[PDB]
């Protein structure tokens, strides 16, 4: 849990090629009271981020084993 | 001579017909949205080395 500070997907080589733009991880940086970290989450998080319409400056709640955000 | 001409013409026509049938089947198999952007989700086993 923490305020969202960074939201960047890292491009990686496509196993199937096709000249498309692929992402292997989505990077979320959360800052807290006496604490801050950056997470290399799996690409699946993009659906939950879109559904919860989060933004920079928002504080969010992401379950470690489920992958959902709130 | 004339029959040989007709026979090669018939062979070409038959090859054209069969190839066109195959092409029509392939076009049927390729039914999808034209020139639209597509979002793809892929999961695969990835080999690893130290």
From Swiss-Prot, chain B:
It is found in: Nucleus. Belongs to the VPS72/YL1 family. Present with 358 molecules/cell in log phase SD medium. Belongs to the SWR1 complex at least composed of ACT1, ARP4, RVB1, RVB2, ARP6, YAF9, VPS71, VPS72, SWC3, SWC4, SWC5, SWR1 and HTZ1. Interacts with HTZ1. Participates in the catalytic exchange of histone H2A for the H2A variant HTZ1, an euchromatin-specific factor, leading to chromatin remodeling and changes in transcription of targeted genes. Indirectly involved in vacuolar protein sorting. This is Vacuolar protein sorting-associated protein 72. It comes from Saccharomyces cerevisiae (strain ATCC 204508 / S288c) (Baker's yeast). The lineage of its organism: Eukaryota, Fungi, Dikarya, Ascomycota, Saccharomycotina. The chain holds residues 250 to 299 of 795 of the full protein.
């Amino acid at each position: 849990e923490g305020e969202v500070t960074e939201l960047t997907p890292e491009d990686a080589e496509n196993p199937l090629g096709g000249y498309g733009k692929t992402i292997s991880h989505v990077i979320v940086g959360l800052k807290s009271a006496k604490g801050t970290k950056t997470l290399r989450l799996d690409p699946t998080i993009y659906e939950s981020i879109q559904r919860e319409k989060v933004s920079i400056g928002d504080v969010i709640y992401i379950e470690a084993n489920t992958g959902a955000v709130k | 001579k004339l029959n040989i001409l007709s026979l090669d013409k018939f062979k070409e026509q038959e090859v054209w017909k069969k190839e066109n049938r195959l092409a029509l089947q392939k076009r049927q198999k390729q039914k999808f949205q034209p020139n639209e952007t597509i979002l793809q989700f892929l999961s695969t086993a990835w080999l690893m080395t130290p």
